[PDB]
Amino acid sequence: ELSLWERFCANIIKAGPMPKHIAFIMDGNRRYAKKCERQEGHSQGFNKLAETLRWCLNLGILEVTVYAFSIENFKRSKSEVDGLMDLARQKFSRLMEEKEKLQKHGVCIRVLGDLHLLPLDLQELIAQAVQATKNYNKCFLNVCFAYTSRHEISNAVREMAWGVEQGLLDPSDISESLLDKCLYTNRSPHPDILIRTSGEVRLSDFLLWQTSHSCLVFQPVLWPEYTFWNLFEAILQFQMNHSVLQKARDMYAEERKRQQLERDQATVTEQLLREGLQASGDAQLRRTRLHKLSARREERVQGFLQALELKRADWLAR
Amino acid sequence: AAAHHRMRWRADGRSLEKLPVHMGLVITEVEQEPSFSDIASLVVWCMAVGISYISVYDHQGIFKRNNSRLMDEILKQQQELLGDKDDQVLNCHLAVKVLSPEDGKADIVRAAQDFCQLVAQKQKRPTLDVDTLASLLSSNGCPDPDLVLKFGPVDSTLGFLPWHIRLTEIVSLPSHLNISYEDFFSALRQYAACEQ
Prior knowledge:
By secondary structure, chain A is α/β, with parallel strands linked by helices.
């Protein structure tokens, strides 16, 4: 449920444009270890996670991504690192056994990262859960475990060389879209707001590709102390620059599309420069030549994406 | 004989607990066409206090489409205040890079096109790791920004070097029009204490 004041402003904020995707960097768990040993704070941080999910669910925020584990967090204390694994196993064990209850409300969970760094059982639980919870269309939560944006894009990068090495795509078909469609978050759309708690003001290798035009919201509160008003202030800030960021996104699009068209029409002429043909257009030699080029890249890339899913779906089995 | 001015600025640089090796200036102010005079003074001040590489970024490209007008004013103010032009003009171009959206994302796909064509030439195999990506981008030589400065109301990076900003500090300021050295210096004084 929500408070009267909380349900009031929600209806008021729901007037204007609303964020369809909001991502959270939950920081400052360690700083709240005042009179707490340190894994007691992390436990409290997971509670405010579920609390904040109630809120976004109340607010009609459809999709939410969270930074649960960075690969950089591997260099932490073995006691503290093993302490995160215990909790990772704990809450995930609650995801199972509490099945079907999760089927009632249309919620799906996706673990995003390079999963080969975790202990086998964690891989199993994570894969167990995501396979079960998939094909649920009302609500979506992306949890980032063992994730860095740097690792992410390098993985999306090597997976498209896979395609050229597999004869499914050719390097001409490589684009911002192709690269866009091969990150772990390809099921999600790009986040509308990024929120990071504590006085820190850096991105920490979190979704650098997908939040290049998202609204950045940094707040001095420690995350365990997160309130609904902390969340409300972010949507407030988001709605202010919505017109700018919309227009900003709307012009990058047109430019990249126009620039892609200028380049595409160029190489069609380069081949027409050879072979002695003329770029006349008299009987649409270049017009059909470019027309076919779009499809051959469209069909060849489209198949690569279907192949990449089948590849990724096979790992879900085990 | 304005050598005391170099003494003053270098003294301010060695005084901070930490100065950025690399810094970026992002100008979100799209209310009016920006004034190169304020931009040129900002980069001039960074060089004076001892910041090696500065990058200037505008999501519409008005800096990249006006490199000559901006480089002109950066040199003039340097001659005007800091006061052998070949070497001076060389160190400026070596230090200041003017950036636009096609340098972060569109460049990321450029290197991806490099590996993939090398894969098609049988020279390259995917089995492409983390440091191989970094050396493959146009930042092969140059490091990553320690600190970016956001000027204007918009609260995004607007596509500014997403790969390189991985651990950088962001400081936003209300505007770059009529900016003063005292304003710009307390930004560095903010970054000096900023957990790095």
